[PDB]
Amino acid sequence: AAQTNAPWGLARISSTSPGTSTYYYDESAGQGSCVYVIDTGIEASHPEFEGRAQMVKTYYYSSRDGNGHGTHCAGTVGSRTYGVAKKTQLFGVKVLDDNGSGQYSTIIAGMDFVASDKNNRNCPKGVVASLSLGGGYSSSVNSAAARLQSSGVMVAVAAGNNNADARNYSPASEPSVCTVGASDRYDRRSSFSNYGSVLDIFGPGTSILSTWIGGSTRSISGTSMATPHVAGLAAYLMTLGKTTAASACRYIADTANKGDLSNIPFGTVNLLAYNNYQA
Template sequence: MLSAATLLLLPLALAAPTQPPEETFIVKMKDGLIKAEAVNGVLSSLGVDPRFTYEHAFSGFAATLKPDMVKTLLANPDIEFVEKDGKVSIYETQSGADWGLARLSSQKPNATTYSYDDSAGEGTCAFILDTGIDASNEEFEGRAKFLANFADKDDTDGHGHGTHVAGTIGSKTYGVAKKASLFGVKVLDAQGSGDNSAVIKGMDLIAKEASKQKCPKGIVVNMSLGGSKSASVNAAAARIVQAGLFLAVAAGNDGADASRYSPASEPLACTVGATTRTDTLAKYSNTGSIVDVLAPGSNITSTWLNSKTKSISGTSMASPHVAGIAAYFLGTGQKVEGLCEYIAKQALKQSVTGVPKDTVNLLIHNGYQKGSDRS
């Protein structure tokens, strides 16, 4: 993040005397301004065309700027900050086998049945910021829609990661909330990578479009992606939650402190670490005090492209378990306010081994009592 006080910290390349490079920056306007007018005024004064404009996640834009333009923006009292665009990617690791869904309704590991209330997230909507979604997959039963693309020119899931995540949230066989409506917002390309500016545009769209969908029981958002800590990504994530949506985010796969990553470091998001089928913290999972809950993440089987399935691992797989259980709880009548705390309250305590002292030992559980089991 850049401010007038930190201008001297800009890379030396920005001060090159000949043909200074142009780079993409994310610009956030101060709150309280008339959004469209403020953004348009700044863009007009710079004489640039934006890559994206933001109105709902926050007021601002992303554009390719020369160093002198950055200096001009830093001197503008209407600008809160200017941040260089950064890279984000999926949090996926190796392949394996299935077990995670049954763990959500069992008191012990190695269960083979998933028991749940048959409301199953009906009346809820899940927005998935990812590589897209293969909405034609029969596992989605017509409840899935590819909503928008900010990553490339291919309006399909060219990778499979987004379809896998969506399947964990709400597919008929592998989903936690089997009756939820699913909306894919593509912000990552076929290699599973993208830019902060595109991710923020995806959040901006969700903040705008969510209320237009038929979601009487509530809305959840999942972000199984991340990159280095970013003030702009965190600001947009916070606004999503403040707008009344539940946001689950992956903690990250570097075995490091999740507070160094975004959106994992945003306090208002529900940040999720990953466990294995033996109730051990996954070695790759990021940790730290910012993590809210733990969820199955290793060797998770879910939907894939062309109506196939695949087993993959990562905090990318843990986060949609939490988004799914959030939709499930909303479907039973819980409110979105305080929902991450409610999920933590329902979780199994001290059941995971290998958890460091600065990280919660809370393994998510749906709290379902057997009697009219579904599986």
């Protein structure tokens, strides 16, 4: 299947060169998989989700996304027009407030919540969690991510937007999860993206068009945006039966486009997520 005039990031992940505008993917499109978006929430009613999204838990007064960040990431995972895995089921976990902020203890709890909750959902193809958040190093946060991964959920986390070594950030620095860096439409490491040996893979993260609250859309940038392309990709691949939760991160690195990125510091992988789609 192909999506013509797609957002640049979707085209990039199904291509072997930058500057294309078509997103080629298998029609299964993630059907049967589930992706947890652990963020500000998701505006489930957005037409773009076509009834495939729902809030399952909030750590605040409302289960809603008063910010839009969560909605945006969610859309990159699996919205109709803007998503990687167009037929995936989405679940929202609101650990972030409407200002886009949250305490570690609540983030931890949201993670522990997903590892249990998945037990009562029908996700035949596998389960993915996308965490577009992070702060200063915390072995507790790290350990929460490791548990989530250990439970059988494919965990993808943002590397952080400090133009610094991700080893100093959490959950970015947790080795057992998939740490995602950002790139731009010219195949350059995004100027804000973190780097370092802890990174696993890069994805499109500068100028990413996606859903927004109020039934709108907008373009924003960050490792937050790249994260969902990888989470969406993992769901897609799981559905196809190419890989599993415990082995998605490695598989994506194994089949990525290699050495194509510029501005990559020595010691950081030069790998760009790629779906290897072939008609």
